[PDB]
Design a protein around this ligand. Structure first.
Ligand SMILES: CC(=O)N[C@H]1[C@@H](O[C@H]2[C@@H](O)[C@@H](CO)O[C@@H](O)[C@@H]2O[C@@H]2O[C@@H](C)[C@@H](O)[C@@H](O)[C@@H]2O)O[C@H](CO)[C@H](O)[C@@H]1O
Ligand SMILES: [Ca+2]
Length: 171
């Protein structure tokens, strides 16, 4: 097997909760600064509270939900890894900002991982990153990363940091 960053693959579709649809989901930047063509790296508050920067990942704005879909048919994907969280670049100006109800990993229509199980009240700017290290079912065809904004999308700068598949085959 080998590891491949999701950001080094093309998605089938990528939808976000930002009002400006000309902005696009980002590879290897958080959503807002990346659409601004800044060099700002993805960064998250880690389990111990420290901030880590990442070279690789995906940057989106949560939506109802916002969905990134990959066609992983015949690829032999056996594992998915990512940190999940709200990028540090987000601005927690008040309690309505940077509040994400849940993030799911869905494979062929089945939720195989959800933050709701450990974080029933969702993610906030100061929730520590969540380490997702996940077996992927044999013969799977579609994988979707879904981030749910809840009441508003403000500040919902969701990053899939270090997001990568492990795969026995080719995409
Ligand atoms: C300053 C800040 O953190 N902005 C993020 C936030 O943006 C939206 C809110 O601030 C909202 C409050 O009513 O106003 C919206 O105008 C604003 O949208 C942002 O700014 C406008 C001018 C456009 O450029 C929009 O594309 C842009 O999103 O929440 C969004 C997600 O909805 C982003 O995280 C912003 O970084
Ligand atoms: Ca929200």
């Amino acid at each position: 097997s080998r590891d491949v960053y999701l950001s080094d693959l093309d998605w089938l579709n990528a939808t976000h909760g930002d009002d400006t649809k000309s902005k696009i989901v980002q590879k290897n930047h958080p959503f807002t600064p990346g659409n601004n063509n800044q060099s700002t790296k993805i960064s998250l508050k880690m389990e111990d509270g420290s901030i880590s920067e990442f070279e690789k990942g995906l940057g989106t704005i949560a939506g109802s939900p916002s969905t990134i879909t990959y066609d992983i048919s015949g690829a032999g994907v056996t594992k998915f890894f990512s940190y999940l969280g709200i990028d540090r670049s987000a601005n927690p100006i008040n309690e309505q900002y940077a509040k994400v109800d849940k993030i799911e990993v869905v494979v062929d229509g089945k939720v195989i991982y959800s933050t709701i199980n450990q974080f029933p009240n969702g993610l906030t700017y100061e929730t520590p990153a969540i380490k997702v290290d996940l077996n992927i079912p044999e013969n799977a065809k579609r994988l979707q990363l879904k981030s749910y904004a809840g009441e508003k999308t403000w500040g919902d700068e969701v990053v899939y940091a270090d997001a990568k598949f492990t795969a026995k085959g080719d995409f």
